[PDB]
Paper text:
[name] (ALLase; EC 3.5.2.5) possesses a binuclear metal center in which two metal ions are bridged by a posttranslationally carbamylated lysine. ALLase catalyzes the reversible conversion of allantoin to allantoic acid by hydrolytic cleavage of the five-member hydantoin ring. This ALLase-catalyzed reaction is a key process in the biosynthesis and degradation of ureide required for the utilization of nitrogen in purine-derived compounds.
We crystallized EcALLase-[name] and determined its structure at a resolution of 2.07 Å. Four monomers of EcALLase-[name] per asymmetric unit were present. The global architecture of EcALLase-[name] revealed a TIM-barrel structure that consisted of 17 α-helices, 20 β-sheets, and 2 Zn ions. The EcALLase-K12 structure had been solved, but three segments, including the two active site loops, namely aa 64–68 and 150–161, in the ternary structure, were undetermined. Based on our structure, the bottleneck size of the active site pocket of EcALLase-[name] was approximately 3 Å. Given that the tunnel bottleneck (~3 Å) is narrower than the size of substrate allantoin (6–9 Å), this structure may be the closed form of EcALLase-[name]. Correspondingly, these residues in EcALLase-[name] are E64 (loop I), G66 (loop I), F148 (loop II), T151 (loop II), and F161 (loop II). Accordingly, these amino acid residues on the dynamic loops may be also critical and can be modulated by rational design for the substrate specificity of EcALLase-[name].
Author numbering:
A (entry chain D): 2 to 150, 158 to 453
B (entry chain B): 2 to 150, 156 to 453
C (entry chain A): 2 to 453
D (entry chain C): 2 to 150, 155 to 453
Write the structure that this text describes.
């Protein structure tokens, strides 16, 4: 007897989308097909798309220490409402930063009973743990995040990057990198402030494309020489993507990601919205956006992730140059991209499924996640196409109910989210069950 | 309920191989998973690999005119015994060559009741049909084959202008062009030269078709196809240098795919010398270092499909020395088991990569919506492969019309135990061929 | 003491153009500098540019057999009046074609005393002499010219014939072994021929129709094919008259990868475009076609970027009867030998600001260096005293009567040209003077590779 | 009448080497050819190669302030003895460093009467003068040197990525090239410390602590930042064919970049370095013979624009200690021409006119020295006479440096400098030493 059968949905499979039923047993996808028979429970997905749960490879929760920025409780409720069933949690903003076993075990205690979704873990590669990267590897982190160019996050200089990447290469861990030449970016920003240039266009001119390209080029070469697998975080320009593409076409093991706000917003809209649209690699002009869409449709951008980066509203007050950078968008990755990629620009459903879930799970070794296939976790989002709503602040489950998407007309709706076989979010019910999420550790799956 | 359930096999799915049951209804995959329930018939696939049936994108049958070379009866039985469930049939050797509605309708009639497997069809782009390419597009070929620079109904090569113009037309119709890429002039003149010198060993024959003759032809057709706006498929690539040309072009955005054949991964010029004219084929079997590079390209994902280029001929055309003998490998029956042994068992290729190379990639390139993958709603086309189970291939084993092959005498480390086409066992290692031939032609606009 | 001193000119040296005097003795440059002393004769070059005389690496004279198209007598007079002092003569359209020792010796005999300029020689690599290429290498040709047709076109016995891919590869291999460069007319002839037939069939016979029937990709395909075959055969390659920047880009990429390849173009691809072709008629029809203005702008950037090694005439005259008919029926070829130096000086240097030493390399030094003409192409001590004096900012309207070709037609007639050839000096003697005409008997000689 | 005629030498002209005479008047080349006539003085170059004087684009003299490392007096005598007639002086080691008008004018005062050769000038692009680059441009430096990455005030200091980008952007505006020492200094330092920690301090350990990839990374970074800034770039002393290849790739894409190397990277290898000790230690390190084979191929392929000394002397006390502790730098100013003539022309078959370009003409053209680098009418009469197939063993006593040490001491060198001529006067002669008071002059960009 199956625990559950989802019937009549347009199911996103590896190869195509088609109307098929999904049988579920013990939290796992037990069968896919027709005439699957009887089950304790039956769901009608007629007229909906059944996607694999989003796998968000770039999520800041920052609980231990900076929990008042978001925290697990609100952060993962918003994730589930946004159709995210697995997040890959960054090591930073949390204090202590997640850099060794004690720091990650501290966070593990902090999270007990608060996980509404499943969560794999990224370790930090920082200046003060190059000697102890094996610790988080043993615990089962799925990658290490660093920034280049006392329990808080710190960047690494060129030598600390090369040495840490060398070690990570030996351990089988990928390095993830925020690629901006921050020295040049800081100094251009100071220059703009001195001159009283603090518009959105001024801020973007202060983080020009070449500062992304230089940093991607440096990181690519050092990671190659170190023998380390590489993932380039939130690429903001098609020029940055081309660097990654050129490297892979020469045989380098490198992947990259972007975020919905580089496909759906632009500098002119960033000006109108204000500091809620400020983020570190900046939202560039519309011609840049067009390039990014072409890269995405060309297959050069492996994953779409949130870079959910909230902060208390006092840090968003004031002019754009002094404000804290970060987009609160975790809840609107799936519906906004389905509307903008699938409905408006004609992207195929299985390509959507790859960009929002499968690729990330394959890159980070999440064996049970990312695909509607026999034996994987029964993690789904039901999406209602051609069903619009205007997003408002009290739709948001964030701790701080703000987002540069508030007031946007969004052409599709998350109607339901299912994690390992149980409905964790329902547009008609809210959150019907106690937090059932679990951490995912590499050697424990 | 379900007509059939295949249980306990290691199934090659798109993403991974795993032990799951397959339910079948009406020639179609009805479900995949566990506890699928009741069925009229149940197969036990324990200890076997259940692969999508091979989609062989490059098969010569040659039935009207040159049926005595192979023909539909023997050729498709060999294919089903080799674990191939869909062939994509070349338009040459048959007479009339398959170049317009009349010639293909002729063939259709000749083949009635003889198809043991399913067959998509290739048109020929030749010198005398440039203006009627739309005819075979209407019938529903999935591509057009040509050879780039006799009998009025035979196959003919096209010069550079006929290629460009034909490809320009095909690009408008949404049809790929498939090309045998060698500079035939240089290969012919080097061959005569070797003949005149009395240099007629296998090594001489390969030296008379050097790598640069394949690279030049590939570079020429890549550029002409690009300027013509036509999707291109480069047939049987024999060198990694040829593969590199295709890779470089795709990396620049050109819509091009390529294929190779088991004899370029499993045989080399030294074994070719030992075997003789049965190992002679047109793009030649090259040396062992070439082979090693070939394996590296395959494991790197630069070769889209593995195909047979099954090319038998009456034995008298294999008599004589290597330079004068007819070129062609009779290998239709041993693509799947040889390749499973050499790629999966001996070199560690993953089951999903093997499934993509032998079936899924070819199905996706030629638009065979129902074939090539174990997925819900696709045709229930499978091969059961028994790993780590060896046999010595003999002529008696061969279902070809001419029971010869350069693989005879080889120890092959895996066995094809069963072949299922649209839900029915068409070949079984123990029962032989249990059902009347049930194969159908596959036409592009009718699925 | 010196035979001659040329004083006060702006002399084009390899590195720069400066006012220096030139001393000549025994037909050779004996010294360069100031206060050179006494000489049997003095010329004033004030206000003039003193350039190396042009080295035209692509001239059709066709004398033995098709002399009535041009021939040595008129052809080299026109060359001298155009400021050319060395030509590198093609093996066609002469009959017999220059393909072996017997054919070139017949030609040497016919040319005796008719050379107004010096002439290095190119052999033909043709379908029927691949086994005899050593003969012309021994004689001393400086290179071998061929047309590559995948099939091999129609032709006359003893005439220039195209080579198929095999013949090109085998010949190129032998040329690589002899140390001889292969020169190639790079156009896919079949595709151009068939598209031309298409146009005629459709009633489309304008100049724009002709250019569309020889599209850029037919040039690029042929260059790519020849680049690769010559590479494999191990042969130095020169790509003749490139008509498009896409063709230049193929040559550049090959060189950047280390291939030994050079290329050239012609003044008509820099100074005419298809719109002027349409107004001019068949006199501006040529095989690699004159393309549109956007193409011309790209050619100018290639040239200024150093990607085109040499400028040559491709002087391709024919009897005017062969210029009758519509553009698709007429014989291709530009009669332009007389107006390479002054048109290009005007268009490159005056109008577009090219440096005088770059002008000198493009018109003379690079060709001399590529084909190993040790005595030619540069104003340097010990080289031949070969010069042309050019008067800048001095214009004239070209008339038929100015032309010294056998057939006094050219697409440049009626053109306003902003500089003038005032004097041409060959091995220390005035052979052409704007005021005197041709003052001495023809003194030109053949230049042979091993007898320099 | 001419002041002088040099007769019967094999003269390296731009296009070829051939026997011709050179007439000189007023310190300039008046004529080249035969039968030039009478002169006040005649020299017999029979049997010698008459080359343009070397143009050394990378010289450290360090006079105002660190004169005791070398100084103009001994430095320029050694240059002249080695056949160098123009040096392009680096802004570093001297104190104050050459970074603005006051520091260079201070330098001009120290040099008076000490210049045996001519000296064009490089400025420093340093952390603290980015807003004042126009001053040295006005004075007439021919480029600006920097180190992209800690020092003395008024000393030479590194620039960070931002200072390099902003400075390069200004320099592109002024029409000045930027010259860069290209090593990832952080990674070299840290690997070097590692070596010491582990007790690994041989020459082979030092080279492995400055791996090729630290050169390639730094060149790639600078290539890309100079491009974005719009600045012409010169890459200093490349040590590896991998670094050259980065430069060649960028040029082939249209970037205006040039590079140089030094004799020690063609003529020494790490195994010799080990036997020599710290006198052969240099910042871009002398690599293994297989690397050296690659460098010779790059050189013969035209991928390296000039050869320069990177003369980097120091008091011998700084050469004490093991290889990891000693000060890096090669004292080799005196043995650039004769060693490269031997190794390149006599041993490896390089053409004389290519030698001329690599040792002189390219440097003069890159840095806009209109009067220098080539034997041609109207240029300065700067020559060196080289005697081929004439060998000698270098001794400490041969050296004119302040500190008479060099990693070439005791080496066999198969050609000899016999005469150096500067603007028409013999300033060095193997038969008479230095027969005229110092007559060198500074060369300023806007005053040639
Ligand atoms: Zn970030
Ligand atoms: Zn982030
Ligand atoms: Zn074939
Ligand atoms: Zn075939
Ligand atoms: Zn031509
Ligand atoms: Zn011609
Ligand atoms: Zn340095
Ligand atoms: Zn230095």
């Amino acid at each position: 007897s199956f625990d559950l059968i989802i019937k009549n949905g347009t199911v996103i499979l590896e190869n195509e989308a088609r109307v098929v039923d999904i049988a579920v047993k013990g939290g796992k996808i037990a069968a896919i097909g027709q005439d699957l028979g009887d089950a304790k429970e039956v769901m009608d997905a007629s007229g909906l798309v059944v996607s694999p749960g989003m796998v968000d490879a770039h999520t800041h929760i920052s609980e231990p220490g900076r929990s008042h920025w978001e925290g697990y409780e609100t952060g993962t409720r918003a994730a589930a409402k946004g159709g995210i069933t697995t997040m890959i949690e960054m090591p930073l903003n949390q204090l202590p930063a997640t850099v060794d076993r004690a720091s990650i075990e501290l966070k593990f205690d902090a999270a007990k009973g608060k996980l509404t979704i499943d969560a794999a873990q990224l370790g930090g590669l920082v200046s003060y743990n190059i000697d102890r990267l094996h610790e988080l590897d043993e615990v089962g982190v799925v990658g290490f995040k660093c920034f280049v160019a006392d329990n808080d996050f710190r960047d690494v200089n060129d030598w600390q990057f090369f040495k840490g990447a060398q070690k990570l290469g030996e351990l089988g861990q990928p390095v993830l990198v925020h690629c901006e030449n921050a020295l040049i970016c800081d100094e251009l920003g100071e220059e703009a402030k001195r001159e009283g240039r603090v518009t959105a266009h001024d801020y973007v001119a202060s983080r020009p494309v070449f500062t992304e390209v230089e940093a991607i080029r440096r990181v690519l070469y050092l990671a190659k020489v170190a023998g380390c697998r590489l993932h380039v975080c939130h690429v903001s320009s098609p020029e940055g993507v081309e660097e990654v593409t050129r490297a892979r076409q020469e045989g380098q093991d490198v992947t990259c990601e972007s975020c919905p706000h580089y496909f759906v917003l632009d500098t002119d809209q960033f000006e109108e919205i204000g500091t809620l649209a400020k983020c570190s690699p900046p939202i560039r002009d519309l011609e840049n956006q067009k390039g990014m869409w072409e890269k995405l449709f060309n297959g050069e951008i492996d994953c779409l992730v949130s870079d959910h980066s909230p902060c208390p509203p006092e840090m968003k007050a004031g002019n754009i140059m002094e404000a804290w950078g970060g987009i609160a968008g975790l809840q609107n990755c799936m519906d906004v991209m389905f509307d903008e990629a699938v409905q408006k620009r004609g992207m195929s459903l299985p390509m959507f499924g790859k960009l929002m879930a499968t690729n990330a799970a394959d890159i980070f070794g999440l064996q049970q996640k990312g695909r509607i296939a026999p034996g994987k976790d029964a993690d789904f989002v039901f999406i209602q196409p051609n069903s619009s709503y205007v997003l408002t602040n009290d739709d948001l489950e964030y701790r701080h109910k703000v987002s540069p998407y508030v007031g946007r007309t969004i052409g599709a709706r998350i109607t339901k989210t299912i994690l390992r076989g149980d409905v964790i979010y329902d547009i008609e019910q809210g959150f019907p069950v106690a937090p059932k999420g679990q951490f995912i550790l590499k050697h424990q799956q």
